[PDB]
Design a protein around this ligand. Sequence first.
Ligand SMILES: [Mg+2]
Ligand SMILES: [Zn+2]
Ligand SMILES: [Zn+2]
Ligand SMILES: [Zn+2]
Ligand SMILES: [Zn+2]
Lengths: 165, 144, 118, 97, 171, 147, 107, 167
Amino acid sequence: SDRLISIHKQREYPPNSKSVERVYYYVKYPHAIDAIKWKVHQVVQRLKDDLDKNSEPNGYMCPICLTKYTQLEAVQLLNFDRTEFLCSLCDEPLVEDDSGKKNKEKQDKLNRLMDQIQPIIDSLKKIDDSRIEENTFEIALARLIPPQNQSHAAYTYNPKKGSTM
Amino acid sequence: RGPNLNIVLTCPECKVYPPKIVERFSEGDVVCALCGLVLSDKLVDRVGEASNPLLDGNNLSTRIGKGETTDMRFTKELNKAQGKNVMDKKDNEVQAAFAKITMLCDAAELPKIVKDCAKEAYKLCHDEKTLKGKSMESIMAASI
Amino acid sequence: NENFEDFDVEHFSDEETYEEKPQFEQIRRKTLKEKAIPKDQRATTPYMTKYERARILGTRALQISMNAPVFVDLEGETDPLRIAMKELAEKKIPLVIRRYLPDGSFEDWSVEELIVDL
Amino acid sequence: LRFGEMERDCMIAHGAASFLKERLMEASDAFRVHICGICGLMTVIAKLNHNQFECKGCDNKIDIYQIHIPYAAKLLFQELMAMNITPRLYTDRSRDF
Amino acid sequence: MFFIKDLSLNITLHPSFFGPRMKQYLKTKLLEEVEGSCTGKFGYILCVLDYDNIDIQRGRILPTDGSAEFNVKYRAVVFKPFKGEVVDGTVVSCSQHGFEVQVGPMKVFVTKHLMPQDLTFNAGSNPPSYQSSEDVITIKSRIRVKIEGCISQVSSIHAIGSIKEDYLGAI
Amino acid sequence: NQEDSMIMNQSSIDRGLFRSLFFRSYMDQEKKYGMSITETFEKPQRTNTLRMKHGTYDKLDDDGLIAPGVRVSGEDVIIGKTTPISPDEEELGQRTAYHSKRDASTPLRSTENGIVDQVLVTTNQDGLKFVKVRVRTTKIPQIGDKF
Amino acid sequence: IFVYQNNITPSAMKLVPSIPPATIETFNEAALVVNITHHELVPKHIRLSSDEKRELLKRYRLKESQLPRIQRADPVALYLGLKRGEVVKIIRKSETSGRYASYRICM
Amino acid sequence: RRRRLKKVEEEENAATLQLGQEFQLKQINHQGEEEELIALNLSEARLVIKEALVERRRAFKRSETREKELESIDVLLEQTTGGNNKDLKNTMQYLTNFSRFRDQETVGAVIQLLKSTGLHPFEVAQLGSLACDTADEAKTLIPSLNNKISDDELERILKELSNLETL
Ligand SMILES: [Mg+2]
Ligand SMILES: [Zn+2]
Ligand SMILES: [Zn+2]
Ligand SMILES: [Zn+2]
Ligand SMILES: [Zn+2]
């Protein structure tokens, strides 16, 4: 799902004729690094957007009904005394949320994320300055090391005719 | 705890609590008994299936069967898919035990109230740490 | 339930029979002031139709039943529909008919100028 | 009593439109539902005590209309939304006759 | 902000007002729920200008109600607030949550998070006020406030004020 | 007597021409859903029973059943049944801690009236007590009876 | 107008549409033995001009699609050589009004 | 006319001149033509509404310091406006307290002085409303003035308007 490992659905014909449609696990380097790049960019963008939402003022939340209330809708729900904001349903004096108190906490979380992800961005800086060969199932077999002797998976690839996907 | 979400039918003119309320089912009206003012009109007095939420809980499941035009391979595949469900394994075994309760009571010609009492006795005593090592036949016989 | 041999035909129930055989512009645009046909070139009939008469009598009676001013002298009349018919008899109903032509255009015919021939 | 389809046809042939409307609305099921002008759906949250209206998604609070439809019509439209069909109701024409 | 705008309103006349001078009942009925009425689309409508001629066209009878529907078109002076605009006003109420300032016909609430930190609430004062090292924010005091967020319903408009920017605050 | 109508003698009707007896039996049972959720044949009281029918209950006895011979009118309770409810709720406004039961009684048909002819107490196959109440009335021929 | 004996080779139908404004109409000899217009069930069809069609649409406040239709394979339509969008004024004997003029547009 | 949802638009912000689709510069009047959007400064609004009220008073009849003006406009409101006048009374006392210019001559000549600017009606209405004393103060109060007017022209306009304001 995170595209770190690709799967190959090749079935071969072993000499005992008890063939099964085995799956081959391998890595597609450019697809994997693009997935990693997209994931970290969406992580930092979502954290920045959460920081922006935390930059919004605190607002309110009615503890009886457990519903948030922004500062804009608090003014439409203030009392005749002009002193307290009352809930629409519970008719309870609104208590303040913490949108802004944790804003510095979210920024420090972003800072502690940023130096930890720094080797990843350094690696992507060195990769973006270089050329990545788009490996596939055939390319990955060039640097293959077999793990066990009696391997039922025959790594020899079988091309076919008629497949036009 | 939580929102109120409760509607009380109090007469806005008599201002008497508790309100004297007469439910005119025939005329579809809820009226105040003291002054005759209606409170809620168009009141609501088959389409689904009966379900007692004390015997099998809040379990809502439907089975797959042959229709007017039905290919059997689809039915077999769907039955195998529905059988391979992990979240209702406890529900599956308590339903199997309820089926065994009904089979033992029917073989004994016990009445329906005995089956209901034995089923609720199994359900209340189900999944108890003090009752874990006993055989299924023991739970069967003791619930009966 | 019920068990009666007196056969009552189930009305509005032809779906049994349906399921038995299941296989076998230039002059005016938008909403401008042009939509009103002017009075000099109104081409509809000057006679007030039975539907126009029914709806004018109903509307006038609904107004009279809701304490509208009455522009005729009452002769002891009480029913709002009969007051409405007396108003229509001597042409004292202050309403008009917007007769919609099929292209959306309309003619405004006053109740006063329409002829009540029926 | 059943005011069936062909009773409605007889009232159509009579030309009594308002009586037909009264039978189908004021005699069986008269429902007031709110719609917004942007999307024709009935997904408007109305708080009549607070005089507040809102359609989420469109995020509009000033373009709300109330209509009187049969409750069977509201049920039909909500069932169509359950079938992933949008029966968008609008209070103004878009094309000529 | 004050504006002059041409508006159209759909007015229902009860059949009791179908008199010989229906137009003046219709104009008065235009008056009492438009003068001072609040609409979120066009702001607080203040006064109906140019009374002598008002576009009253032919009114449609509702088919089941019996009331006449007139779409009266008129020119009126309005007051529509916006975000990012600077309006002066006077404080009319104060609390620990903040204070409400009256701007034109409309009250704008300035929250406790939107004053500078030198300003703090002093409930012991009579009337309660917000006190700082250089100025006080009391009732019936002129104050310049910028509106940075406003919410308008179908009939109610509420705005959020702030005086934390420089060249704002009391006047 | 036009279009298949008939004129039938009122004096003959008074003397028993085509007068008929009509019996309607009402069945009811008390069933044990669980342990405490069981129905009970008893005369309900407005103080401790919810959703009582607005028809009278005075014709019932202590067992919740009307005695044979008692004249009944429309929507009168002939079998009184109560089931317990969950305590400490808030429904219809007129809900208190006194209401430990709800009314599951069987009223007469709203248009029907007559005389309770026979009341039959017994147990079903399951052993649950169930009752059968027969109400007798007479249909005197009138305008609209089919002959 | 081409009047053939029995049939045409289907490989000639592709060249039957020629360069405008030339129009090619093919008629079978067997289909043209009897004039269908002389039949008592066939009323008088009169093709309308462009100005007549415009006046017809204006006076009845109509559109092109709101007219009654006649398909461009109808034997009377092929007899009159109707093209798409042409309107024929059909005059037929009426048992309630003697003469009744109808209009059909060629789709 | 198209039936697009067109639900995406920028928020109404006075800094970015976005006042809504019903507050564009060109406005279609009831007689049909496009006409310039009318934005009134507070003194201008007070004069216009007072003229409307005295016109309505004259129609009803036929059918200066702040203290003596407040009572006069109050009795004018009582003799002219009926119910739901609370918002109108608040507006009139607001325009009385925040009145930069008293008579019609000052307001009209302020309009023809601001018409030499050729700026947006909203920002010149704000300039006639807000009593800014320095050009950068008006720039930070009204963000529309950024890259719109020269600093020396803005300075002379503001100090002129300071000379124009009376009492
Ligand atoms: Mg018959
Ligand atoms: Zn709440
Ligand atoms: Zn009451
Ligand atoms: Zn919407
Ligand atoms: Zn709801």
